[PDB]
Design a protein around this ligand. Structure first.
Ligand SMILES: NC(=O)CC[C@H](N)C(=O)O
Ligand SMILES: NC(=O)CC[C@H](N)C(=O)O
Ligand SMILES: NC(=O)CC[C@H](N)C(=O)O
Lengths: 531, 531, 531
């Protein structure tokens, strides 16, 4: 049974929702029982998303293996319901760096190294390597950038070569384009699509399937015209209309027949997908039994893409619509009005002093006014800082990240004793939950894994005291590779309806099919608070 | 002093308002005192617009010389304020037919005839010939179609050759493209523009000026990015935002600096344009002293492009906003409600029986209820028919176009005596107005020219009787080339506030700077009726 | 059983021998028993080759139906061994003229007519119409021009559309390109091929087969590289090396596997071609039993393409190599040296006085010195003129074409009595051969058809006298459609080893498989003369 490859390119304009299309096709294939994996090719020169801002210009996703990748990997994980790794985000920097380092070591045996075939071999090899490791039966590869630009050329060439390498029936090429619709003229402009496919053909790729992005679905007559001038059969031209909920996409594509078309094109026996989860999730999103509002007091108010997705997953499970009120951390200054008509307060992650003191106030206000509180990473550090100051009377308490000279570094770098150097804790780390805690009630397990991306920890030296003040350490980590043994992973308050914080980013693991308990509980408590 | 040529191409999509851009640049140049002319190249194979439907799929304009052309010629005439001719609408059919007929006659002297240079020579020759006849100092040529399609290729090549033929400083190339704007992302997508210009460059043309069509104006920073990747200097990239009134375009383009950029590029001494007319016309359109509503009882409710423009011109002169209520002729069946809140009824032109009887009812209703009435071409024939039936008691009266067997053909083909064969009366025909009539009051002249396009006339044999019944022949034509001597050109009613009809299409000559009197009076009477 | 279409395009440069490739594939298919036909698309604007010079810039072929076409039709007829017609030479002029005339007649029903789909529909319709009339099972269509130029675009689009129209397995696309070979570097440059195919793909066509034109055959390794970067399978990339004899082409292509590849691609059951004729003809050309030299006293010394082919066909049948000595008619002035080592003199066709008197001398010299003489069309008129002057003593005798005022118009326009106006006799005309003549000995029939293209005939009024002088009219035509009844078609001399002339162009019908008797005899007589 040969491995199947489905490549996805985009044309006309850079933004078409190609990430969600890839994810949606991934879901339709997994809904058929196939073992699938998606690879996001990002033509940029950055080796990885590690040197970029973690939130500001859009969230940087973190995989179980600790890789910092493009946010699309998160989409992919959510729609396919599986962990991806560093190998699922391929960049120009990675490819050129390996090939270049390889020829400096003389491993190319004195020959002249070139984009073709050397850079292109590296690209294909990485695509196959990761698909092998994940035992994929079908692999969906999304080419970032836009057909017609310079950066994606090496990648378009690389994937073009797969048809010959893999043999007939094992590769399929899909191209997504923009079809402008004039509300007045009431007409769909297909020329951009025509020119884009012609350009793609010029580099050597003939799409087998086309998806036309437009405000509304593209009429059959129009789709036929496009089919005939592109060399794509009529039944292989589909629409990608704009929709209210992202979860609707897999459904509308399957209904039009994308799934069937794909199976056939790959010469696979027809399998009836089970889309029961998506259908119900979309039903819940369109008809919530109730709706509650919570506030996100962040300093970056797609910076919290995974966070917002996590809230949505929890909402669905609670059969409730979760409305988000964005509260600018720094502005925190009438809290009564800022959190008016708010049944929950969430303090997300971030770096830098900006907004810290503002978040501190939100936490205090949420602790005193018995308002559900969820703190993620920095959110926990904030809570620890606010508790340290106003409950343990540790005046000036803070994190050395914000005040390197505070007299009470309740949050500081990795303790020298627990170190092995100046690197963050990234990826999955085991978390031992304490029985009888709120954390325990939510998970229902005593041992779990959550993903991390931070360089500051709760200072051990202060734990004993804070606990005496009434702070509960509902979770700790046994460490990993002899590092961070004993570090605090979660904190909560006993005399509060819902006050929880975690050092990790549990949003990163949240899947619409399997919500993150910390968020499930947060939403549940919110609803409770709303009475 | 060399003749200057400004070529205008379009890219990305077929609809960008390139016709109005051409017209607007034409206006800015005439506002500088230059003798200008515009040529519309229509890549279609039709020799002319003569075999197309006159109204249904958009109006077919008629020039003073009787040529049936694309509607853009009308725009051109209105913005430049000058009559154009058959030579101002160049088509593929015209070009290939002349070259082909020429080689069949052996006039190419036994050589192999080809698209290049023979078809391209014909195109350039026609462009120069018409510009010469019109003594143009600056000629604006608009290339129909979209860069990247097959049909316009011979024309793009033809105009590319002008740079070398005319010598430096005498040719300028402008390209209009679509820049999609995402209301959400709040971003302008410039890739389509980039790809389009790259394609244009590929055929051999480097634009000197670019105009970016988009919902809103394109920011300076964005325009600079486009300038740098297209080879067009920053100061030569302009915006074409969507606007309320067409007359605003010349103004916004001049303000941004298109006029100045053009003069400079053509090496002409700066001239301060006088845009006083446009500024006031736009002021009137934005702030009408009053507004009246009139109904258009037509069978095609851009079929009446020139008609609606004519109403707008009249409105401006009357400093009033004219609201049009579309009344489907055929549906005419409660007239009281159909013309409710209507201070004027206009019955436009058309061919075919469809809606005739419905129009007849509108006329009768407008004659009895003393409601201002304006009938254009068919509009007059309708009025004559309704008057014949209900005032002269000529039962069954009609036009032989609708009832070839009516016992009273008050409207029929060109009288055999007045003929010279089965062709329509097209283009300007002299009209002798009768002193003391409503027609006379409106024009203020006794002799004028109006454009025609019809094959039916008021049957002479019935004039005497109809006049006795009370119908007034306020105009007749002395004929032309010994044809149609004596034919009725206009009719009106003495005992009515405003009841007028003309055989010609006076909308075709209406200019915003010089409104058509028949419409000026119609609007004036409407206002009167509204009290 | 579906009709199969094989399209042939050319890239990089205009001259690649694509005409002979088309012809050669045609031969391989007919050698398999298929009914085939070839259509030559000539992108030029000339409706037909009728207004071009008949010889000067290359011969203009004439088909049985009297059509004047591109010389490729001749190749086609020779390799396929079948008569083609006007419909086998499609031009831009024909296509645009029909569509244009059609819309002027309003036959497009008021719609806007465009290159696509109207011009393209006309092209496809003409291709199918002619294939139907000829009951073709396989049709080979050659696209003139070069991929990448403007003129052939409408045709490339037209043929691209056939794949969808005809359904899978019924269309095949072949592209011929130039692969430069550096004699020094000893390398084949494949980039031109790469860029050309990329351009072809850009217009929407993916070649299934490629033929690389180069000085020498392209190595397998190189062919594989081209296959991989063009999307064409390795076994479908072939070579077209330069060769000594044109007849070698079908053979080398079949040997490489073009025939097999084509049958398979069209989903046809393998048929073993019988290439026995070509193999022997090539054997004869490489190893002639003998060789003789004849002189061609023409005024255009590919003007005589069909003539030279006819000589080659005759040579093969006589198992002798025929060497041609070009003798410039006008220069005729030492005949002894001009015809030194010449065993035969041929005077071909032409128009105009230039060289007439020179040809006259060659004829006289050939008649007196008992040297084999073959006169084609003008060649016969010359002989009649020379005989009239020097044997019948008709001083000043001539053709009115050269001397409108000669006192003895032994050759003049179509006799007024035999006319029906000022048109030439074109295409096949029946020729009644007289028993016992040299003409009869050669053909072996009394009635045959030969193709014509001339406007001058032997003046009847002079026949009687010339016959008395000793001239023999070995053939006459019963006329056609009541025209030219009785006209002289051939003349010969009784007291001469070989002196023959014909009014028609028997070269046009000569096929390598079936030589034209007049030439067979001419060569035979030449050999005889050489002793
Ligand atoms: N993303 C975050 O929440 C980071 C919190 C803090 N900067 C740390 O390094 O721990
Ligand atoms: N356009 C018109 O108004 C045409 C009216 C009528 N068909 C005529 O030929 O006179
Ligand atoms: N091609 C020819 O041989 C033409 C001969 C001569 N011009 C004729 O019209 O008969």
């Amino acid at each position: 049974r040969p491995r199947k490859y489905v490549f996805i390119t985009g044309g006309v304009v850079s933004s078409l929702g190609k990430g969600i299309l890839t994810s949606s096709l991934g879901a339709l294939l997994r809904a058929r029982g196939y073992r699938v994996t998606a690879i996001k090719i990002d033509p940029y020169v950055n080796v990885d998303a590690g040197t970029m801002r973690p939130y500001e210009h859009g969230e940087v996703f973190v995989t179980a293996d600790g890789a910092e990748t493009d946010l699309d990997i998160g989409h992919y994980e959510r729609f396919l319901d599986m962990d991806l790794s560093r190998g699922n985000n391929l960049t120009t920097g990675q490819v050129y760096l390996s090939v270049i380092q390889k020829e400096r070591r003389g491993e190319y045996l004195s020959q002249t190294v070139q984009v073709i075939p050397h850079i292109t071999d590296e690209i294909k090899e990485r695509i196959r390597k990761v698909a092998e490791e994940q035992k994929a039966e079908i692999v969906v590869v999304e080419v970032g950038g836009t057909v017609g630009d310079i950066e994606s050329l090496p990648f378009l060439e690389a994937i073009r070569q797969f048809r010959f390498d893999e043999g007939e029936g094992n590769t399929l090429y899909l191209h997504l384009t923009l079809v402008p619709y004039l509300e007045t003229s009431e007409e769909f402009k297909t020329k951009p699509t025509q020119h884009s496919v012609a350009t793609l053909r010029g580099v050597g790729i003939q799409p087998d399937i086309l998806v036309l992005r437009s405000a509304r679905p593209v009429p059959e007559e129009v789709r036929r015209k496009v089919a005939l001038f592109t060399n794509v059969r009529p039944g292989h031209v589909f629409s990608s209309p704009t929709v209210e909920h992202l979860y609707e996409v897999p459904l509308l594509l399957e209904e039009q027949g994308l799934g069937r078309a794909v199976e056939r094109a790959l010469g696979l026996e027809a399998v009836i997908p089970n889309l029961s989860f998506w259908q119900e999730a979309v039903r819940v999103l369109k008809h919530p039994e109730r709706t509650v509002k919570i506030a996100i007091a962040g300093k970056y108010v797609d910076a919290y893409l995974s966070l917002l997705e996590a809230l949505r997953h929890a909402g669905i499970k609670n059969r409730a619509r979760v409305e988000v009120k964005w509260v600018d951390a720094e502005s925190l200054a009438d809290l009564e009005e800022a959190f008016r008509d708010v049944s929950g307060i969430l303090v997300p992650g971030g770096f830098g002093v900006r907004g810290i003191e503002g978040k501190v106030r939100a936490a205090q206000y949420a602790r005193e006014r018995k308002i559900p509180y969820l703190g993620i990473c920095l959110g926990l550090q904030i809570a620890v800082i606010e508790f340290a100051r106003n409950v343990a009377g540790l005046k000036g308490a803070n994190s050395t990240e914000f005040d390197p000279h505070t007299p009470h570094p309740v949050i500081d770098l990795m303790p020298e004793q627990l170190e092995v150097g100046g690197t963050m804790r990234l990826g999955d780390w085991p978390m031992r939950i304490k029985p009888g805690t709120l954390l325990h009630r939510l998970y229902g397990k005593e041992e779990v894994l959550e993903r991390h991306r931070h360089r500051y920890e709760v200072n051990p030296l202060y734990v004993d005291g804070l606990e005496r003040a009434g702070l509960v350490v509902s979770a700790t980590t046994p460490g990993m590779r002899g590092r961070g043994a004993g570090l605090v992973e979660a904190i909560e308050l006993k005399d509060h309806p819902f006050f929880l914080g975690l050092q990790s980013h549990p949003e990163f693991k949240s899947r619409p099919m399997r919500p993150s308990p910390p968020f499930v509980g947060f939403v549940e408590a919110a609803l409770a608070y709303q009475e």
